[PDB]
Amino acid sequence: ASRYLTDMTLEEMSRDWFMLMPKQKVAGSLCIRMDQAIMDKNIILKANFSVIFDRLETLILLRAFTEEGAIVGEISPLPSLPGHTDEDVKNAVGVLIGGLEANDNTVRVSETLQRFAWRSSNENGRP
């Protein structure tokens, strides 16, 4: 009970990234961002988050990476607002996955994300 799992290095967390067609939605006090100009690639969802009672407790940051490393999506707590709940993070992941898959993207969650708050079921990838 009570851990802190990190999929992303400090570089991956702090790295600047640029959306061509920005699409921002808000799930609770979480800011979901993604590039609608991304299509037909395999996307991994990596996240830093704390667990408690073997559930996800607090999301620190979630980012969507392509196989080549480009950041194309993000879920983050809004800086001006208070925290979020275990359900808010799962809703934001559903928004990011469903929004990313509508552009024929093969979205996959990390192993640690799959252990505490996952979604999808996954589709096929394009060569």
């Binding site: 400090l10 967390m13 600047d16 800011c31 620190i60 983050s76 707590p77």
Partner: protein, 129 residues
Amino acid sequence: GSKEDSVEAVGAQLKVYHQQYQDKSREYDQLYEEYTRTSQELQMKRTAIEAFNETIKIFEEQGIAEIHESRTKLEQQLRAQASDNREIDKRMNSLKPDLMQLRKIRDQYLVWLTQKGARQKKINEWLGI
């Protein structure tokens, strides 16, 4: 000198948290390295005491006398080293919550600064690259 005053002040807090994380991580690594050093020496003192009283049991049915004081000096050093070894385990068991909370709040300040407009170059400035 208004909303950036907060961005600069929070970026200053990111420094201090990053300093404290790397300072305590350096401390935690000194303890784990010294813990496995002593526990190995505990292992050796153990089977050295085994062979110490096993030379007694193997050659007491036939009967070389001042050897008992050596086993008594090793048993004395053994539980004296295992005592300091437990204290090392207590010192670094008390650091694991400190390393986790520091590492988590350090990352939260990074994400907060990123959301407030700080680019990767600004984050690396406060992070010491």
